[PDB]
Symmetry: D2
Subunit: 116 residues, 4 copies
């Protein structure tokens, strides 16, 4: 599992469960190709997005569908999504955790990058 996403809710003090996440990879022609997608579990985690074979070097975009999350809770939020765009694996394979902490009008995101 070289790519994991973790999402927390700053209003509830809980994991953000059932959050849709879409990952894109920039293609040769500079468009964003779908790469993988999933949704967070009861613990706010999304495992199993990709494999070390498929997760090659590239520029990746992790789109966390925050609007749909808040709307399902009955809240009208500010942002459409939280986006995280980064070059991956450019000095060899790494493991990436992308974490996000959500509020209706704000979010924060961080990356934890480790070398297997």
């Amino acid at each position: 599992c070289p790519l994991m996403v973790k999402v927390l809710d700053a209003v509830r003090g809980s994991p953000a469960i059932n959050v849709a996440v879409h990952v894109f990879r920039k293609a040769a022609d500079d468009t964003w190709e779908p790469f993988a997608s999933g949704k967070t579990s009861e613990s706010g985690e999304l495992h199993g997005l990709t494999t070390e074979e498929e997760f090659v070097e590239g520029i990746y975009k992790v789109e966390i569908d925050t609007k749909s999350y808040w709307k399902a809770l009955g809240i009208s939020p500010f942002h459409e999504h939280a986006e995280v765009v980064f070059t991956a694996n450019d000095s060899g394979p790494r493991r990436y955790t992308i974490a996000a902490l959500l509020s209706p009008y704000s979010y924060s995101t961080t990356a934890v990058v480790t070398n297997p």
Copy 2:
């Protein structure tokens, strides 16, 4: 101006000065059309991006070129850029400030929407 951008640096404890910021508006075919851009001032602010007449309801993306900012300071960054995507809604307050707080491997962003 109905749209202001403020950028801060969490490593140096300072405004993020001379950061490129690009604003896009989502077009009918779901593509992102350039809308406004500029660089942040000595106070980390970018004023004058648009006018009330131009800034209609729609989906907007603010892209902050964080990678170039960090590189100009000699610091190794994670992200290509920081992106903030939101809907402008006339039912809410009329002035939008998009604030971002930057670190090499993280960022925070908030909206301050006032009348």
Copy 3:
């Protein structure tokens, strides 16, 4: 004024208005002595806390009464208060802004230190 406090609300997307803020200075016996206090304005800011003559090097604590803020808005909060503890250093820049971004179960804080 060498010390300003700015408070924002991440739930409403607004300044955090009428929030009590208390500043303390660490005394020789390691106790916290009251130094300055006030409430944030309509812009979420608290100006005029101190003067250059009064604000000497030392360890300071800024306590933001977040629990009362959230309760006055009808929102259930986690923290008793948000605390920011730092050393004022004359070797660095001369104006300190302590900024805080509040959510019910989280907060962010940064320092903007400029000349």
Copy 4:
């Protein structure tokens, strides 16, 4: 383990390892009594601070020694520590994770509270 602390480094993109953490509990006389302490592991986590017997209702302060962390990395940071003050267990026992994300001039903190 009803109280866990997790600390991340926003400069390195890593767990914050070897961070000292001190927990205090407000006593009857309004002073801060030492309650427990420890340091984060290689994963940025601190487990084993307390037990469900000892972790009674009260007002707790979790002090994360950020200054000492940054100084050990050769960096002069702004804050002395990151402090998190909260009432715990007032509607019965809960499990609390206090997470912090550190930069030299900034930090963010959140709580994840779950009911066993």
